[PDB]
């Protein structure tokens, strides 16, 4: 209770109108979104507001949108954004629910640039109905009942945030109320929170809450759509809180997010096909380790299922799940010759106390599961890891800036190669990025104005129509900014590939076949390294470790062992379970949970690499204070019986909430680490263990309840290191070396000596090159007398003219104006903009001829044609970018009318859809390319 | 000798002019091949001769053809196959060799329709120039001296053989004798005989010449004068080997003569030769890797280099001196080093290995990637007959049939419904690739592809629907139907668990006796599973043909870690009495695959049958063990008597490799014998497969058995004498008294074929479907009509479009009447050309865009084809789409256009070609559209 906020605070929701109020959920939800973004009031008596019926029976939202919209108060403009039609009729039709997605309600609120108290503090934009997977508690309760936000973080600092929070000390207390104490009004329902967690110049980062639908105008009592249901009782349905009082609070409201976690129900496996086991696999030394921790089996048919039910290629061997209050990892289980469906959970698997009666209960969900693997590369964040456990320091890191230098020079290579005939950057082109999930998404490549969205399905899109990179300029314009922002990146990131690595999901060994530094490694399909290919790993040295890695022993060098008996499971790697500590947690404390591990078989880095033992950490509880009150101890405020119980359980959630929303310092620690590090040029020395084992301890802050506030930072970097002060950007972070003398440290030296001549090099090639294509024939030029076409076509004729001739001069005079325009928000709207004056330069006998009105597509005819045309002769000057994004797809049109030659076969018009269905098929490449050259 | 046949036999060559002594060998060919065809002669006279030259300096061909025809000449329909220019060049300007491959010269003969005797008996048509692999003989003595014919077997037998030859016995010695005795001239090199064998596809024999000499050689002890007699003692190192038998000797010439990729030359210390084969650790002497040996990991990425292969192959077939076999990476090579070995069984002649040649890996095949085998038919005997149970044998095999048959039909039917769905269905139920590449584009007959498959891809491409328009319908209907009628014909069992795959044997003693050891480079996936190795499970292994009892055997597969670098090939222990390959139909490791297969079905039942006891077959199988030192006895001694020695070799030989084939025959009767008797096991099984195992390797193990044999032991070991029917299962339906019980009978015609009908009996009851329900699909396309009703508009207030318009609609009547009325597709084409002569101030400027060299891209095409579906969709639907099926597409793609909704892509045609439908694309679009 601050207040000042509140006021502010009012009053943050749209109104629910009364003539609004016959619903349905979709309806009020789409409606409202259009006068949001209309900047029209929903209790307006002058708009003569309503309700029609039609909106009822409605399958796409534009029918209730241009109702409407209409009224000339909407106009406006157009959008919002609008959900897709399969989903809006779930959401009216369907349950919200279309098999395995959820149709999701979402809203982001960013700070009111308003002012004063009684101004809300909050906007509100709400997301258009969209589909995600569902999760266990939108397939228990129904995907409506479910609302999200993004909401900026009240304990943000700075400096971008309103005076009135934060020059006000607690009302960080005054947010968290606002959002946990009561409920909230939103379409016709009452919404309360239940969770929060972090989202999935410099801005504020936002934090993600959810709601519950506890009641609304349509729901009904109780106890006993839709009936009126308490957040404190989902929470008791998800969590069975009578068996789970001892847990920590912090550490149970954690576990909520078990229950929204995305997954694919596989099967419901009966109480006899479970096997839960008292105890984890330990250590057979006695140190009480547990040896296979979040990992445990499922049978054979359970694994076919999954394959079954998810529509894989191939049974996989294991996967991430939940089941229950169990999260973590299956494994196949190697020894089941049976057929009869079962599964295991162990300790270290299950989160809360489960009896595992309800279905729901006993229904193995899916996050992820183990797929065929892609070569990882090696990231910048393991070379001072690798560096620092080299047998010799000059050598490896000679040999990591040779292996960059020819990496880089070997893609260049290829491109340049490529370059040199259609079929084969085209080729090229669709191998070097995925556009299949954007073409199913749209049902067809998706275009702005004039050409596709995407630069790499523009240069196929004109290639496919006989333009030719070598030939054409923005061919070769586009070819090149794709190069060089491919450059920019690796002299950022520096993920220097390393053809023979990969990351692989853990697994423990549960068969107790592999010695205490063995792992086996099989994968399910052949593995492939520029010369040499693996279906497996065997009697060799291999690199293990887990992203970040932060001590010394954070990579771990180990032999790959190949056994017999784990022969079917692939596309994992097995860890023993004999020794004294489990493998995975000597990378950075992982476990068998979904952890995978960057595996690395590459000769030359594995081979100069010493392992170093366990860093003896320091103490560090003097900053870092565990709230460990357990949900028993709330309810002793209460007392006992199912109202103190209620009341326990939204304590928890606004204690938790108020824990949920304090800084993350793990980023800052992190960063601090990365900086001392750097100056330090050692990630060994006692400054390093103490930062590593910091970063560590806060990374799993949430669930350990670990307070760590800005007080403790600062007490313990002054009481253990620097420098309170900061320290300086490492130069790396520099685009040129601003440093003095040579690079020292290894980043500095791989982006500055290193990659940034080698790029420049390399970019020096074909820029010389440009340059070097006058007249060779070759080169590369704007100009091609094939586009204009249609222009002198129409010169001609107009000339003879009369009066088309007068046409002409309009449709010139017309295009001048739009240039023009283009001249002259975000990016793709301005686009837009220009790319529908350009469609409205619209014209007996002749008009009727260019205009063929009898097709419902103006841009397909002849008219359009003509317009490109006469552009490109006026314009490929002069505005190149202009006339090939306006009319790139006419132009192309004409290309492939013009390059065609009587018997030697027919160009194809192919519809959209159609078009997105087919790719490149490299055998004909290949062979033809083969059949070309002898 | 013998009288006729002589001189009945004395030109056939050409017939090497003045005058063209002079000009390359490929000139000459070439030149040579034109008083071939189209005639002339010798011989004159008339009209000009000699020199040009380019001719002596061309870089086509092509041309020099070009000189004439003066001439006039011929004007003989300038048509020759012709050789393509790189090879022409190579020939003409690089040596006959480039890099790997030799340029060959080939001939065939077939027999004079003409006679009687001065006429020469047979014709000689020369082939052009080609390119194809060379071989160790061309590599070390130039591609240039070697001449190859393909002549009519002269023991043929028969009917259709001239009279002339037999009957007239005994000149079956006149003409080995006329093509082994004496040189050949041909296009001025003097030819002379040296290996013959059967042809690689009346039967036709290849025969072998080597230029000794000719117009432009020169004497010794381009280049030099050298016997074929001082060319096989350069292969064979003849001094080293007259201890070998004759034919044996000669049956070696192949290994010259194999097409083979030359690797790399070893030094003399970077090879090991081994003194004894890998023996039966039981004593038996037995060899355990009879044709295989090791070779070190740096040859064998030497391999891949050269070859450009992907990958490092784990085994490779080839030759290397003597050595012929297999060679195996030796997986203990930690080293870098090349070094190979060669073991006893591996050389098939004593060799010094001195000669850069002698000393060269050649490369016939590696192990690659594998495909699924499947069950052949053949296979089927032998495994009912080692069935456990075999009710239930035969139960599973129908059930395997029937599913695999209503599955293949079910899918075919669903894929219909989308398009989406049947493009990818029609995608893989035939490959174009192969087409495409040749043509670089989808090759057209008129408006329309050639292949209806083609053409309902092309269709659905522009937005027709095979479930709404009935041209679509129509053909997917065809194809079904057409298909129907191959598995009536084609049984087909289908088994994805199997692979054929190269045998090799295990060197380092890790595979006990029935165990073997299986990895794969990738995943050999099988519809809802996937193999990367096999390990822990019964295996079926068997060489075909298998006809034993004993010829397939189980066993059991498991995966030794030592032998994981292993991949595509299958590992046999060398342990145990008998090697596993001998038990496979006398099976070994130089280059045999073996049939292997994993699936649970067939493996399960099958029990392993012992070696049969094999019958003495001396009496009728009789072999001539005749030395090469025993041909030299009736000669004496010295270089004289070794080259008159030779030349015996070569004319005994081609007596016995020229003898008829009953390999064939006595295998034919077998399978017609044991489907009477339904048996595999019995004594005339045992006794009959005992044969043909005899006869396999009849050419150099000199067995002799002639007709006379033949008969002799069909009349006392069988047997009629008399014709055995052939199975029921060769002809198309069943004729046939009651029930099948043959299992090859039963499975075509009790399983398959009732399943088979009830589909063309599906089909037909949706032939009826019908009439006006609406979907039915139609020939009616409103769309379709769009130019034609937008000119009619035009031609309203006309005054003068009308005039056209009334053209246009006259030209079209006239050209669907021609198209009313060879072969095929010339007449299609000619009404084609009609068609596209239907051609038309500015609406005819603008209907025509004559910018466009390409006609059929003008919006007159458009409104032309719009006008002729307008007018004959009802009457002539085949005329319509057949002349105007492209445009058509290009007018529903339009049409089906709509603003906001993606783009249309106009493809050229050679870009069109190379794009494939993407099966993820298909599976993840439906799997949206179905929620
Ligand atoms: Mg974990
Ligand atoms: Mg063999």
Redesign the interface.
């Known amino acids: 209770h601050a207040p000042v906020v509140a006021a502010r605070l009012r009053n943050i929701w749209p109104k629910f109108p009364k003539w609004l109020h016959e619903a349905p959920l979709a309806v009020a939800w789409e409606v409202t979104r259009l006068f949001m973004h209309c900047k029209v009031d929903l209790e307006d008596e002058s708009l003569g507001l309503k309700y029609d019926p039609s909106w009822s029976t409605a399958r796409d939202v534009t029918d209730i949108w241009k109702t409407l919209y209409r009224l000339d108060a909407f106009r406006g403009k157009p959008f919002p954004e609008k959900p897709p039609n ?1 989903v809006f009729v ?1 959401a009216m039709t369907g349950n919200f629910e ?2 395995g ?1 959820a149709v999701v309600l979402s809203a982001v609120l960013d700070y009111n640039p308003d002012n004063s108290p009684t101004a809300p503090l909050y906007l509100v934009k709400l997301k258009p109905l969209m589909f995600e997977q569902g999760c266990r508690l939108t397939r228990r309760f129904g995907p409506d009942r479910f609302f999200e936000i993004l909401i900026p973080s009240p304990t943000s600092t700075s400096p971008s945030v309103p005076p009135v929070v934060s020059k006000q000390p607690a009302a960080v207390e005054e947010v968290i109320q606002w959002l946990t104490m009561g409920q909230h009004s939103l379409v016709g329902r009452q919404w309360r929170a239940f969770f929060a967690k972090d989202a999935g110049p410099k801005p504020i980062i936002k934090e993600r809450v959810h709601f519950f639908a506890e009641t609304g105008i349509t729901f009904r009592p109780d106890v006993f759509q839709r009936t009126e249901f308490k957040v404190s009782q989902m929470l008791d349905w998800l969590l069975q809180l009578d068996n789970n009082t001892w847990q920590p609070h912090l550490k149970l409201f954690s576990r909520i997010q078990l229950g929204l976690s995305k997954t694919y129900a596989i099967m419901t496996l009966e109480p006899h096909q479970i096997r839960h086991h008292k105890t984890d696999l330990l250590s057979p030394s006695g140190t009480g380790e547990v040896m296979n921790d979040g990992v445990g089996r499922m049978s054979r048919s359970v694994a ?1 299922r999954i ?1 079954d039910v998810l ?1 894989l ?3 996989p061997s294991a996967v991430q799940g939940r089941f229950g209050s169990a999260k973590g990892m299956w494994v196949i289980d190697v020894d089941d010759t049976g057929d009869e469906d079962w599964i295991e959970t162990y300790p270290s698997q299950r989160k809360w106390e489960c009896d595992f009666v309800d279905k729901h209960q006993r229904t193995l969900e899916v996050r992820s599961v183990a797929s065929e693997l892609k070569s990882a590369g090696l990231n910048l964040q393991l070379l001072p890891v690798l560096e620092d456990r080299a047998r010799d320091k000059v050598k490896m890191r000679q040999a990591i800036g040779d292996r960059l230098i020819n990496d880089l020079q070997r893609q260049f290579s290829e491109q340049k190669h490529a370059l040199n005939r ?2 084969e950057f ?1 080729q090229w082109v669709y191998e070097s990025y995925s556009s ?2 954007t ?9 702005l104005a004039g050409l596709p969205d995407s630069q790499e399905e523009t240069l196929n ?1 004109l ?4 333009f030719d990179p070598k030939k054409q300029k923005y061919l070769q314009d586009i070819a090149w900014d794709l190069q060089k922002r491919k450059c920019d990146t690796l002299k950022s990131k520096l993920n220097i590939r390393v053809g023979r690595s990969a990351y692989i999901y853990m697994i423990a060994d549960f068969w107790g076949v592999l010695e205490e530094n063995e792992v086996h490694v ?5 593995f ?1 390294d520029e ?3 693996f ?2 790993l ?2 060799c040295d291999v690199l293990v470790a887990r992203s970040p890695a932060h001590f010394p022993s954070d990579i771990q060098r180990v032999r790959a ?4 008996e784990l ?2 499971l ?1 596309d994992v790697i097995i860890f023993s379970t004999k020794g004294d500590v489990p493998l995975a947690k000597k990378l950075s404390g992982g476990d068998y949970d979904g952890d995978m591990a960057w595996v690395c078989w590459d000769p030359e880095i594995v081979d100069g690499f010493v392992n170093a033992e366990m860093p003896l950490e320091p103490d560090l509880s003097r900053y870092l204070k565990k709230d460990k009150t357990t949900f028993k101890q709330l309810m002793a405020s209460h007392g006992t019986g199912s109202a103190a119980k209620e009341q326990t359980t939204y304590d928890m959630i606004q204690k938790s909430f108020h824990f949920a929303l304090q800084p993350n310092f793990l980023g800052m620690c992190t960063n601090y680490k990365e900086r001392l590090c750097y100056i330090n040029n050692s990630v060994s020395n006692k400054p390093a263990i103490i930062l590593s084992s910091l970063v560590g301890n806060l990374v799993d802050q949430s669930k350990q309840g670990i307070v760590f506030n800005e007080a403790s930072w600062a007490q313990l970097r002054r009481e253990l290191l620097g420098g309170a002060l900061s320290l300086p950007d490492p130069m790396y972070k520099s685009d040129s070396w601003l440093g003095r003398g040579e690079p020292t440290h290894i980043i500095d030296y791989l982006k500055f000596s290193i990659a940034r001549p080698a790029i420049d090099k390399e970019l020096e090639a074909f820029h010389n090159a440009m340059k070097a294509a006058k007249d060779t024939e070759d080169g590369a030029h704007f100009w091609d007398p094939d586009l204009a ?2 222009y ?2 129409f010169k001609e ?1 107009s000339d003879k003219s009369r009066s ?1 001739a007068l046409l002409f001069t309009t449709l010139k005079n017309r295009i001048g104006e739009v240039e023009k325009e283009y001249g002259r928000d975000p990016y793709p709207v301005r686009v837009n903009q220009v790319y529908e004056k350009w469609c409205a330069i619209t014209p007996s ?2 008009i ?3 205009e ?1 009105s ?7 005819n ?1 008219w359009a044609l003509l317009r490109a045309s006469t552009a490109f002769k006026l314009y490929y000057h002069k505005s190149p970018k202009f006339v090939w994004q306006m009319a790139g ?1 006419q132009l ?2 004409i290309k ?7 018997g ?18 490299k ?3 290949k ?2 390319v083969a ?1 070309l050259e ?1």
């Open positions: 399969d779930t279309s098999k997605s076919k394959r529509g290629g191939d049974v259609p079929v085209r299949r999930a073409r199913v998404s749209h049902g067809r490549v998706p275009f899109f290639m496919n129509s006989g099989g994968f399910s399909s052949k492939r010369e040499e290919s279906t497996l065997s009697d062992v190949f056994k017999p022969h079917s692939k076409s249609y002198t076509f004729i088309s006998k002749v009727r001829l260019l063929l009898f097709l419902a597509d103006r841009e397909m002849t797809r192309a049109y492939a009318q013009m390059t065609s030659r009587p030697e076969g027919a160009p194809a018009l192919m519809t959209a859809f159609m078009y997105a269905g087919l790719m490149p098929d055998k004909f490449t062979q033809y059949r002898g």
